[PDB]
């Protein structure tokens, strides 16, 4: 009973027992609505009219109003910007990806210049730059790569009070801090890293009367600030006055926030100096401890210390606002030169275009999108990756805290996160607690505060009027729970109800005391987390791991929706934006492996091009396939084609495998996994991986490289797959080592070997003298050449300086599941494949059906994730189908929930939502009435177990084993990517040690702790060898190779080059270091074989 809203969406029967009173909002709205505010689109106009005041202003309109008008110091001239308009887009998205461009639109504005003494008003339309644009999917394209702007967590402007304890006698010491929208701050009156500031030396009070302060008049407090914060200059009477007037009263310097001003006026008074008086009164009357406070003109404020992690005092700046702030920076940097040109030039001859240099705004936008920590390479292993990435909230970055100045209380789950930031989905590693994901139903508001929806309660009556509350508004109310008994008409059945109050604590209050109720369970969860069946049965560690590992599934050649899922797979796949969706209801007029054309009813034609075998940012294969047939009538929103990890419109991150839970000969020891070789023969876990090799011919000192099929002394047979250009041919199968693009690089004459010198002399060779710098395929890689793209400087192809030609070979490979690959269930139950057994010796059921995967029993109980077991049971139920016996009534176990679950055909699609859905009793009931197989044999008994035969000896295993169907994902951690060895390779020019990294054919690092270990063994010679002739001895290593090749003993080791380099660095530090003999001076460091 789910997915009824989405047309054509398959029928996934749901065990849920609660009505869904609110659908999932646009799971990308967090990004879109933000950008649509920034731009001022009609969408945002209507959305603000529906839930906002009558005077809306977009991000750019606001920036312009703030900047206007650029005025001369004498007030003689004034420049005013207005009416931000966009042209159409320069190039489409796929075009920008192909050409390595930046999807953007030209920005235009009306610039009105006025000379106050000539009356001349020359209006003009000025162009501000190529403003980068947000795509349908909510991303950006910069330099041809797709990027996401992750929302940032930061402290909203305002004043905040806290209560510390002094090291004197544990006295309760109050402190305050004022965080501004822009400018400096202060504390208590210490200001700008200058302590020892009496609060009374700058202007019933308990200690305000005690201030100690010795002065009278206004010049003392005016001169003390210039003598205490503006040093390096004598004490003056005018400069201190000027600075004090330009500190906080001045609006140019000190930017009073809008959100900040709202928060502060809510903290002190409905309607600056008033604020400072209220703040002093607040600190005083907080040192006392009184409940409320009365300020002149303001009233009704609770005297209380503020929580720094509360979501009513912690906001997030969406993409729109980050862009707005970068634009403000560029605009101020431009206004500087605008005034600086107003000064010099003559009036009546300066047009808006003459004094407006946009270079700083362009550079600001560019630097933001290209260097900000919040513009991130889009995680697109699969649709769920990108969907969560867009909805993500991180606290690091410019303007937030530091990855090292962020302690542990920052990373703690605050009670105000309920329904706003999911508490499960967060990284396990260093970034833990710092990167969360937006809750499913959550929604950002104009001020950057995360609101969440609740059903209104009128006289213990759950209504259908929904209301969105922020953390503050919520705290001030009593929120019922979603799984609260309610009779029709919205009436709590129980005398009282469980609820949450402001203290972050729960209570059991009479029904007439409830204000709002949760819209649904799982309201606190994120999208990924909401997709773990039987979540409540899993510990938070393994559940966090399950979410994180769902975001790592690799798309498989053929995708299969989970036999048992939540209700979120469909909506997740759709919002993610990797499936094609019918924008307008019509009739399929044509369908091909290439495109899909629908004829709308009003005669309109719309066509959709299928992404076919597209490489993703992480090598996964984005490949769409249509799921409509010619003549099919499709409604608006219906899914037209499946994406990479989707099936009929549902997130299909893995496959349904026949699992047996039992230790099998140790091959699944200590988390290993055993797979049936079927999964290889039938490609059940096979995936496609597309890599992009690139190579350019550029200008060198000795000339210019040339991409040529003619490479020095290469066998005609080796080039057999190269075209005339020296580029491999499409569809060619390339093993590791083959050539991909031939290239020669001008070589100097001094480098020619003596052999080559004589060869070019005797045979009268030419003066080419090049080196083979051709692009070869790296180790552990192979595949068919999917594609070839090429860019020539000859043609009108734009490339960097000195780069003549540039070719890119796109190579695909089909990876079969293999030993070493990493699989995992949705319950944080990960493991590498220990062995892939022949189907014949796999344990099999009575009917010869061999299991597909053997999961070691010893791994389940201690991890506290029996969720996988419940899933196995329900999955077998769904794979066999069932029929609850209704004759003589409906059994009590199936009475509560089951409505259309009383029977189900084999391979039925069922969803068990989190915190609702399948109950243990109902699971057991279904397990009792399993349907039989072909021969009318019930294979899995009422415990969920079944006898199995040892496919090796033939004898049956003595005890029944739990067999079932489990959803297993192929996580993007594959041996093919991680195997790496090296005998000898490139070294670093600085340390002369082996390069690091597989991509560079590097060597393993023998770290300090490894040398400790080696010493503990007493393996002196092994440690020396590892550290001298394998790393740094520039002659020792070549000697070692020469000795191995000629069957001679390994020579004695020399001197690590890194030591010479250390000596050189010391010397450069003016330290005279010197190596000495037993009794001698400093030792110094620094043909016949060739002639032979």
């Amino acid at each position: 009973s789910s997915n009824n809203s989405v047309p054509g969406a398959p029928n996934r029967v749901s065990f849920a027992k609660l009505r869904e009173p609110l659908e999932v909002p646009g799971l990308l709205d967090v990004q879109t609505d933000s950008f649509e505010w920034l731009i001022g689109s009609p969408r945002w106009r209507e959305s603000a009219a529906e839930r906002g005041d009558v005077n809306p202003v977009g991000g750019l309109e606001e920036v312009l109003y703030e900047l206007s008008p650029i005025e001369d110091f004498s007030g003689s001239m004034s420049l005013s910007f207005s009416d931000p308009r966009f042209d159409d887009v320069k190039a489409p998205v796929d075009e920008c990806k192909d050409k390595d461009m930046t999807y953007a639109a030209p920005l235009f504005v009306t610039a009105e210049f006025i000379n106050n003494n000539t009356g001349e008003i020359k209006s003009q339309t000025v162009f501000m730059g190529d403003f980068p644009m947000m795509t349908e999917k909510g991303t950006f394209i910069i330099n041809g790569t797709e990027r996401v702007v992750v929302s940032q967590l930061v402290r909203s402007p305002g004043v905040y009070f806290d209560e510390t304890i002094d090291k004197s006698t544990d006295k309760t010491l109050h402190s305050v801090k004022v965080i501004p929208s822009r400018g400096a701050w202060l504390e208590f009156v210490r200001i700008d890293r200058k302590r020892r500031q009496p609060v009374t030396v700058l202007l019933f009070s308990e200690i305000m009367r005690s201030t100690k302060d010795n002065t009278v008049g206004t010049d003392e407090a005016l001169l003390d600030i210039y003598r205490k914060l503006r040093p390096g200059e004598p004490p003056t009477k005018e400069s201190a006055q000027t600075l004090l007037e330009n500190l906080f009263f001045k609006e140019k310097r000190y930017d009073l926030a809008r959100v900040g001003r709202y928060k502060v006026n809510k903290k002190l008074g409905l309607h600056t100096e008033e604020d400072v008086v209220a703040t002093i009164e607040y600190l005083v009357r907080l040192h006392e401890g009184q409940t409320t406070m009365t300020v002149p003109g303001g009233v009704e404020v609770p005297v209380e210390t503020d929580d720094i992690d509360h979501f009513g005092n912690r906001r997030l700046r969406t993409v729109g606002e980050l862009i707005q702030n970068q634009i403000r920076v560029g605009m101020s940097r431009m206004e500087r030169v605008v005034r600086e040109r107003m000064t010099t030039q003559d009036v009546e001859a300066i047009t808006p275009q003459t004094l407006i240099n946009i270079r700083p705004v362009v550079a600001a936008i560019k630097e933001f999108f290209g260097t900000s920590q919040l513009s991130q390479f889009m995680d697109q292993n699969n649709p769920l990756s990108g969907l969560t990435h867009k909805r993500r909230l991180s606290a690091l970055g410019p303007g937030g805290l530091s990855r090292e100045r962020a302690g542990l209380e920052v990373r703690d789950v605050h009670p105000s996160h309920y329904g706003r930031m999911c508490p499960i989905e967060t990284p396990e590693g260093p970034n833990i607690g710092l990167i969360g994901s937006l809750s499913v139903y959550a929604r950002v508001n104009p001020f950057g505060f995360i609101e969440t929806p609740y059903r209104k309660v009128v006289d213990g009556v759950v209504s259908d009027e929904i209301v969105y509350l922020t953390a503050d508004e919520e705290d001030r109310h009593v929120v019922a729970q979603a799984n609260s008994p309610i009779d029709a008409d919205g009436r709590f059945v129980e005398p009282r109800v469980l609820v949450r109050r402001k203290a972050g604590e729960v209570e059991y209050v009479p029904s007439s005391e409830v204000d709002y109720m949760d819209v649904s369970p799982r309201q606190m969860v994120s999208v990924a987390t909401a997709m773990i069946p039987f979540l409540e049965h899993d510990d938070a560690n393994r559940a966090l791991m399950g979410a994180n590992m769902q975001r790592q599934a690799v798309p498989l050649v053929r995708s299969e929706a989970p036999l048992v899922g939540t209700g979120m797979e469909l909506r997740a796949a759709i919002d993610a934006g990797d499936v094609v969706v019918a924008e307008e209801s019509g009739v399929i007029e044509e369908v091909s492996a290439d495109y899909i054309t629908v004829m709308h009813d009003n005669g309109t034609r719309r066509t959709y091009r299928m992404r076919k075998f597209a490489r993703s940012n992480h090598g996964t294969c984005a490949n769409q396939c249509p799921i409509v047939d010619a003549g099919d009538r499709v409604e608006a929103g219906q899914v037209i084609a499946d994406g990479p990890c989707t099936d009929d419109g549902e997130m299909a991150l893995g496959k349904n495998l026949l699992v047996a839970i039992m230790p099998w000969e140790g091959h699944n020891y200590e988390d290993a996994i055993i797979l049936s070789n079927r999964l290889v023969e039938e490609d059940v876990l096979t995936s496609i991986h597309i890599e992009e090799h690139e190579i350019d011919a550029r200008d060198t000192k000795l000339g210019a490289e040339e991409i040529t099929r003619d490479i020095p002394n290469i066998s005609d047979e080796v080039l057999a797959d190269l075209d005339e250009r020296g580029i491999v041919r499409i569809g060619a199968e390339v093993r590791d080592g083959d050539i991909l693009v031939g290239k020669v690089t001008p070589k100097g004459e001094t480098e020619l070997t003596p052999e080559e010198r004589l060869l070019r002399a005797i045979f009268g060779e030419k003066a080419r003298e090049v080196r083979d710098t051709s692009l070869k395929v790296p180790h552990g890689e192979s595949g068919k050449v999917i594609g070839i793209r090429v860019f020539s400087r000859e043609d009108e192809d734009e490339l960097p300086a000195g780069v003549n030609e540039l070719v890119r070979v796109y190579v695909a490979q089909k990876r079969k599941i293999s030993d070493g690959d990493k699989l995992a269930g949705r319950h944080g139950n990960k493991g590498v494949i220990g062995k892939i057994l022949p189907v014949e010796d796999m344990p099999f059921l009575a009917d010869g059906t061999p299991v597909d995967i053997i999961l070691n029993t010893h791994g389940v109980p201690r991890r506290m994730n029996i969720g996988q077991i419940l899933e196995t049971h329900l999955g077998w139920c769904a794979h066999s189908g069932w029929k609850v016996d209704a004759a003589k009534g409906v059994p009590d176990w199936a009475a509560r929930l089951p409505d259309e679950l009383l029977e189900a055909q084999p391979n039925a699609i069922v969803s068990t939502p989190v915190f609702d859905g399948a109950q243990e009793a109902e699971l057991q009931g279904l397990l009792s009435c399993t349907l039989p197989n072909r021969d009318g044999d019930v294979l899995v008994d009422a415990d969920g177990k079944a006898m199995l035969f040892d496919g090796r000896s033939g004898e049956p295993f003595p005890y029944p084993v739990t067999v079932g169907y489990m959803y297993i994902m192929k996580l993007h951690h594959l041996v093919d990517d991680k195997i790496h060895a090296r005998s000898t390779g490139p070294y670093s020019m600085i340390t002369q040690q082996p390069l690091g990294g597989k991509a560079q054919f590097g060597g393993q690092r023998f770290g300090e702790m490894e040398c400790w270990a080696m010493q503990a063994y007493g393996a002196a010679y092994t440690l020396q060898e590892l550290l001298t002739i394998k790393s740094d001895d520039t002659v020792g290593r070549v000697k070692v190779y020469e000795a191995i090749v000629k069957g001679e003993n390994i020579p004695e080791p020399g001197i690590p080059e890194s030591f010479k380099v250390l000596l050189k660095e010391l010397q450069s530090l003016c330290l005279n270091v010197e190596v000495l003999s037993s009794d001698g001076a400093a030792i110094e460091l620094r043909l016949e074989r060739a002639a032979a």
Binding site: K747, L759, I762, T984, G985, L995, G997, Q1000, V1038, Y1041
Partner: protein, 93 residues
């Protein structure tokens, strides 16, 4: 710090790449083909082709170090170049 990615990517366009211990040690070994092709010629004309082609001396210095006139040196040069191109023409390719 310039990265290993940057170092290797630079070597991808340089006159000499980041060489291996293997490459060095094998370079140190003798090229049997050309060594055999040289050992065929009379060690006088071959010593001349050495002092003239491998080392690049001027013909006057070759006459000096050979203790022979210039004409003999250059005639040995011509004859030896002809011979070795004969034996090393199919080898050069």
């Amino acid at each position: 710090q310039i990265t290993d990615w940057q170092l290797a990517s630079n070597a991808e366009h340089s006159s000499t790449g980041l060489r291996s211990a293997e490459v060095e040690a094998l370079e140190a070994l003798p090229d049997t083909e050309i060594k055999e092709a040289l050992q065929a010629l009379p060690e006088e004309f071959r010593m001349a082709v050495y002092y003239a082609d491998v080392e690049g001396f001027p013909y006057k210095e070759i006459a000096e170090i050979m203790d022979t006139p210039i004409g003999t040196v250059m005639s040995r040069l011509h004859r030896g170049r002809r011979q070795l191109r004969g034996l090393l023409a199919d080898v050069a390719r």
